[PDB]
């Protein structure tokens, strides 16, 4: 396919890139699994998109297939001055070069900036096990659990990030928890700060300890004060509160399964590889291991609407009474947001009738890993007609009833980084409207209860505070409305007050249409202080048959506000969250608003979205990129136990045609039904697809749950 | 059954009330259809809810069933000083009184304020046929259609409201249109202003004429100037192979053919909700519902977990406020309760309007009718998968496997009706999720309000076809949300995030700038009347004094989904009719004299209506430990665009709000659901799929499609 230009790497390709790099013996490559930080390893391999200039020549002007390459992130820890360096490896097939990417003169913290890995976690656990030995009796008395000879009663930890107070530090606060079903909700009241910056884990140290509201300096000191009675201790078969297992009873119990979708005539969309056709729609998709889901080269009616719509970052920003809590600003691209695309359970995560798609990731692994049912694609009834009208004759009857059943195409994946489960949707309606949606579920990020915690959260159980936080998500929306060069305008209603033209002594105070043009980037960078104009329009200079510019409208569904003070420390990592909408001129050097490095060096990251606006460029008839921030404040509440639920917990945006088509583009749909009356006879039910009452069975439920090399 | 207290009038009850009034010969009642305005007629009969005090004592304290009554609106046209007077007729069964209802002594303009009727429309058509005789040749030449001697090429009109420039006037602008398929979108360029205030239709006059950008004084004057070649006329093409642009008939082809039917719901096990009369049980939920003929859908006595959450959530008003270049366009402020928003609940098409698996419900309305009228499939109630899990988690072991996967399939219960007043089809949903979340939603579809294109119209709308402007407007909807959170006595508080700037407690040379949780308490109505200029706090909480087991007040959170803003200037003329639209949220102390924010009379006397919402805030009452009522304005600006042809579509054109428990329950109330599935690993074995309901693969069929399309007495 042509859409293959946008496709993620196959298992064959990942092996080819990996083998190529491994045959370069001077890289001294070792497996991700090797239990030392003092090693060189390939941390991530994923497809590296070609330049847009070359892609559009191939797609639109019949030129050469662009060169295909892989981005390869290499952790160089086996050298005097450790760093991370990225390369473009190509061509594919038949790799033979390795070209260094994105140099950064004067930046010294690339090593400290890197994501945590499985090997690093194992070394942290060992550090923890050793360092907390003096606390063994303290653990047994207070929790009934421990790190030693613990078996089914083991302590665990959750690290928070960022990890220190300045660029170059790798000092993590660790929340100690009981490792039981839903361990996230079982903090013991102990937190530990561990310096794990050295490539020699022998050097790693607990530098500070916090327990039940007091700092202690070391595990030995806490152990001593415990022994001398100078510590205020909290000593910690229905289901566990942190379990999903049912309990309680509805006043009106429900004993049977609810209604389900059947698809006896098979999918109405066509999936070939990473390429989808659906009525008027055509698009390609990919699942970028670093940043997550994208749709690319989106067309309706054979015309381009958007070159790229992509998830860029997903953040959860906390306050807290405990050190771990006040430390937490999670930026999930730093945890491989697009690589934790775990198995979709048929019937639950997508309809039983969905098409489930597998993929492969190479992220912190020894070999490419198979991820079954990583995505799904499905049509489902929306339960509301796309359009309907009852045309009454106002004398007890009707001229006609017309209706179009509501259907939507949904491309879906998830990310479960750790405790959060985010459900990522791109949704395509038959009338050319597309929607992006993120739904939040899974376990809340929580810390140990003390009275002081009630200033930064809610008590959810006996020992549990749900910390206040804001979720924010950034999308890149590279609209190319009917072609590459667009303009941006907004529309507002403004009142006029005129003489009533048929009654001169009176006034008419009424709506008029007010149009605002935007010439320069800064004018189109909307802050949260300003109210957003109601119509956000991306226009083609082409006019429709009625004289109006062909356009697509962006409509944001969000509750987001300004969270961090602009200019203050870690806020440098998320300057995009200043803007619910910002428009930039397309540049190859500005493809992403975040990176895998932002989480662990938010102070001096390699991409600062705000910098994209510094040159305040002209945006009249240019390749424009819309960037959208959506989010919501989440003050936890008892109903979040065991999990946050999806209803009302979604954000996103709509893209709607606005004077783009001559009339409703869903008019081509043959699903429409019109009912007409006949004189002294039955009504005529006019259809273009026969009525269907066929039923069928979906595959029986299965779930694997493992993700392994092939 | 107890929910009967909330039930709409039966066909038998409506007849009983109509019969009782007709038996009083001094009322001189004539049928609605009699084509004179100088008549006495019963315009509307509907159930009149008993006092909350009495309903609650019945429902909660074992006291007597409250007396059942009907509201009866009587048009007294057959007298020297015509008026509209309402009565409460009761008891039911066995009506033997008619007491005064909503008396407004000292008000004189009730007649002018009254809704238009089928009979009045017929007299308007007759007036136009006569008044426009001079324009007959003009009509035939410019449109190919006529008012006089027409059969299949008839001109029609669409009247706009309000009908004048001050209280007491009934002067309507009429948009003249060709009566073809989707006639709404076929204006001729002519608009006529008719004074139809007199009860003698012989006095009615076309007082002004607008055609293609100029005013003309009379039909005779336009006819003369046309004859003398002095008018720039627009000759419309003949509208009567391809569908008319205003038809829903398909045209064009998708580049990727869709020839088979899409996926559809099956319900082999039947409804999981228990619907009995107007009472519904659904897992945690219990509620009653009704469809008030005047104002529309209501859910009542809403409980979850055996505790009351809301005494009433109801539609109050639905408005479309226009601008325009034509006089009709610039006049239009439609308030749909003045047109019987609750009475235009036309037949829902199975498989389209609701799923084929839905339970469809008939009702009866008595609104501008000679007899109670049967409305087939006025409502539907159905459960549908949402396509998104209510909750799910993959608990990875971070080494190629998992500890468990847990998920709960997404389902929701939807109670739905529609209102097709004229051109708009509004779809009204109340939605109930198994975790105690409820949602109110309105979806807009149908035909836009449109006027004749001229270049000047581009300042107030969008050219949608050759001769067609879609006028700019804002949709505004008002809801009454009488939350009774765990009981009648509530308070209202909001939560905001506020940053603090403190010394980093483990690194003294540094700062922690972080979120804290800030709580604001509200004491008086005015403090909780949030205007559209004001930032709406992110957490709007209606609280009960009772705490959950973790020490937090039990509450329900109101979350608004809207794009609405201030449309009319506060205090200016017709804005008096929609002062509720100043507030996305306002909170009032409960009162029997303040049950409604609008009325059927607001549309035609917006200057001096019987209820001004702002007056509910005047006395600035205490709202601590009180029976509170939340009132919610939602809406959107709609600038029409060519994709609105032939109809506005529902995607991205809905508004509403959510109610969500906030520390009301000790933990997730969906935990009682047996639909939850947890998959667990086993060493050297297949996974154990833990269930509490057996896996379903069953099949069934719904009934074959039928549609009637008529609504008549039985
Ligand atoms: C709106 O119109 C209604 C009906 O025409 C008015 O109610 C009617 O009021 C008249 C005059 O008060 C009542 O007529 C009779 O008057 C004689 C004496 O002159 C009296 O002895 C009779 O008992 C009788 O009252 C009539 O009862 C009453 N009809 C009804 C059904 O109530 C109403 O007053 C008008 N509203 C306004 C604001 O003017
Ligand atoms: C990060 O470390 C890498 C690998 O050690 C450095 O790249 C090497 O630099 C040496 C000295 O110039 C070259 O001779 C090698 O060819 C490079 N190796 C590879 C694999 O490219 C690099 O200089 C360091 N990066 C930064 C920014 O300091
Ligand atoms: C619309 O404009 C009119 C006229 O400019 C305003 O009416 C004037 O208001 C002042 C103060 O109330 C009166 O003294 C004048 O006599 C009015 N003039 C006329 C011709 O009516 C009116 O207030 C404006 N309305 C709005 C909402 O802006
Ligand atoms: C938080 O408070 C600190 C301390 O009051 C502020 O830091 C001071 O900033 C000024 C510049 O405006 C410097 O001259 C001082 O040296 C700083 N004091 C200290 C102790 O560092 C800080 O700016 C505040 N931050 C925010 C976002 O309000
Ligand atoms: C999950 O998937 C894996 C991989 O397909 C399954 O393991 C394979 O099982 C087949 C069939 O018995 C064996 O022949 C292979 O040796 C296995 N491959 C690997 C890589 O282990 C596994 O059985 C599935 N697990 C569950 C619980 O269904
Ligand atoms: C619509 O429903 C009406 C009312 O039930 C049907 O009208 C009845 O039709 C039957 C014959 O099928 C007659 O016996 C009755 O006399 C009719 N009743 C009335 C009140 O008119 C009608 O047939 C249905 N229409 C369609 C098109 O299905
Ligand atoms: Ca720029
Ligand atoms: Ca672009
Ligand atoms: Ca009051
Ligand atoms: Ca209340
Ligand atoms: Cu959250
Ligand atoms: Cu509209």
UniProtKB/Swiss-Prot annotation, chain B:
The modification 2',4',5'-topaquinone is found at residue 424. Coiled coil: none annotated. Glycans are attached at residues 83, 141, 501, 708. Keywords: Calcium, Cell membrane, Copper, Disulfide bond, Glycoprotein, Heparin-binding, Membrane, Metal-binding, Oxidoreductase, Secreted, Signal, TPQ. PROSITE patterns: COPPER_AMINE_OXID_1, COPPER_AMINE_OXID_2. It catalyses: histamine + O2 + H2O = imidazole-4-acetaldehyde + H2O2 + NH4(+); N(tau)-methylhistamine + O2 + H2O = 1-methylimidazole-4-acetaldehyde + H2O2 + NH4(+); putrescine + O2 + H2O = 4-aminobutanal + H2O2 + NH4(+); cadaverine + O2 + H2O = 5-aminopentanal + H2O2 + NH4(+). It is found in: Secreted, Extracellular space; Cell membrane. Binds 1 copper ion per subunit. Disulfide bonds join 150-154, 354-380. Ca(2+) 2 binds at residues 525, 616, 619, 621. Originally identified as an amiloride-binding protein (ABP) that could be related to amiloride-sensitive sodium channels, but later shown to function as a diamine oxidase (DAO). This is Diamine oxidase [copper-containing]. It comes from Homo sapiens.
């Amino acid at each position: 396919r042509k859409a293959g230009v946008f496709s993620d790497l196959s298992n064959q390709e990942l092996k080819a890139v990996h083998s190529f790099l491994w045959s370069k013996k001077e890289l001294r490559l070792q497996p991700s699994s090797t239990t030392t930080m003092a090693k060189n390893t390939v941390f991530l391999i994923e497809m590296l998109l070609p330049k847009k200039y070359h892609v559009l020549r191939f797609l639109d002007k019949g030129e050469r297939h662009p060169v295909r390459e892989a981005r390869a992130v290499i952790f160089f820890g086996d050298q005097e001055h450790p760093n991370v360096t990225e390369f473009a490896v190509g061509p594919l097939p038949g790799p033979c070069y390795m070209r260094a990417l994105s140099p950064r003169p004067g930046y010294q913290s690339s090593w400290a900036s890197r994501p945590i890995s499985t090997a690093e976690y194992a070394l942290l656990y060992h550090t923890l096990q050793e360092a907390t030995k003096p606390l063994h009796q303290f653990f047994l008395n207070t929790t009934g659990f421990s790190f030693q000879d613990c078996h089914d009663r083991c302590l665990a930890f959750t690290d928070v990030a960022p990890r220190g107070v300045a660029s170059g530090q790798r000092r993590s606060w660790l929340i100690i928890q009981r490792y039981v079903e839903g361990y996230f909700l079982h903090p013991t009241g102990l937190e530990l700060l561990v310096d794990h910056g050295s490539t020699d884990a022998g050097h790693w140290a607990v530098e500070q300890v916090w327990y039940n509201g007091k700092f202690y300096g070391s595990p030995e000191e806490l152990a001593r004060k415990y022994a001398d009675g100078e510590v205020d201790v909290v000593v910690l078969e229905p289901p566990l509160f942190s379990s999903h297992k049912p309990r309680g009873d509805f006043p009106s119990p429900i004993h049977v399964s609810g209604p389900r979708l059947v698809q006896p005539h098979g999918p109405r969309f066509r999936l070939e590889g990473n390429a989808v056709l659906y009525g008027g729609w055509s698009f390609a998709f990919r699942l970028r291991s670093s940043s997550g889901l994208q749709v690319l080269n989106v067309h309706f009616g054979g015309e381009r609407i958007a070159y790229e719509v992509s998830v860029q970052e997903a953040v959860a920003l906390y306050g807290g009474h405990t050190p771990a809590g006040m430390q937490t600003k999670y930026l999930d691209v730093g945890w491989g947001l697009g690589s934790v695309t775990h198995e979709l359970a048929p019937g639950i995560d997508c309809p039983e009738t969905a098409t489930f798609l597998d993929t492969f990731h190479y992220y912190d692994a020894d070999d490419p890993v198979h991820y079954p049912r990583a995505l799904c694609l499905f049509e489902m009834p929306t339960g509301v007609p796309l359009r309907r009208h009852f045309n009454s004759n106002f004398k007890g009857g009707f001229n006609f009833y017309a209706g179009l059943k509501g259907q939507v195409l949904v491309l879906r994946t998830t990310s479960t980084v750790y405790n959060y489960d985010y459900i990522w949707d791109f949704i395509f309606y038959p009338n050319g409207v597309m929607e992006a949606k993120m739904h939040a579920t899974g376990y809340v990020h929580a810390t140990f209860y003390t009275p002081e915690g009630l200033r930064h959260g809610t008590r959810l159980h006996t020992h549990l505070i749900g910390n206040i936080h804001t979720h924010l998500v950034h999308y890149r929306v590279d609209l190319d409305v009917a072609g590459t060069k667009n303009s941006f305008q907004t529309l507002q209603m403004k009142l006029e007050n005129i003489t009533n033209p048929w009654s001169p002594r009176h006034r008419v105070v009424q709506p008029t249409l007010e149009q605002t043009q935007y010439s320069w980037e800064r004018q189109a960078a909307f802050r949260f202080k300003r109210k957003l104009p109601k119509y956000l329009l991306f226009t083609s200079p082409q006019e429709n048959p009625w004289g109006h510019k062909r356009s697509y409208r962006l409509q944001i569904h969000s509750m987001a506000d300004q969270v961090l003070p602009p200019g203050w420390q870690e806020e440098q990592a998320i300057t995009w969250a200043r803007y619910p909408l910002a428009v930039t001129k397309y540049r190859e050097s500005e493809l992403c608003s975040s990176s895998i490095y932002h989480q662990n060096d938010p102070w001096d990251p390699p991409v600062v979205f705000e910098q994209f606006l510094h040159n305040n460029e002209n945006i009249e008839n240019e390749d424009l990129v819309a960037w959208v921030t959506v989010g919501f404040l989440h003050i936890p509440h008892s109903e979040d136990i065991p999990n946050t639920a999806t209803p009302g917990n979604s954000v996103g945006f709509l893209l709607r045609p606005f004077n783009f088509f001559p009339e409703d583009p869903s008019l081509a749909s043959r699903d429409t039904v019109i009912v007409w009356p006949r004189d002294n006879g039955p009504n005529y039910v006019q259809r273009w697809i026969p009525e269907d009452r066929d039923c069928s069975m979906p595959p029986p439920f299965s779930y694997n749950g493992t993700y392994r090399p092939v």
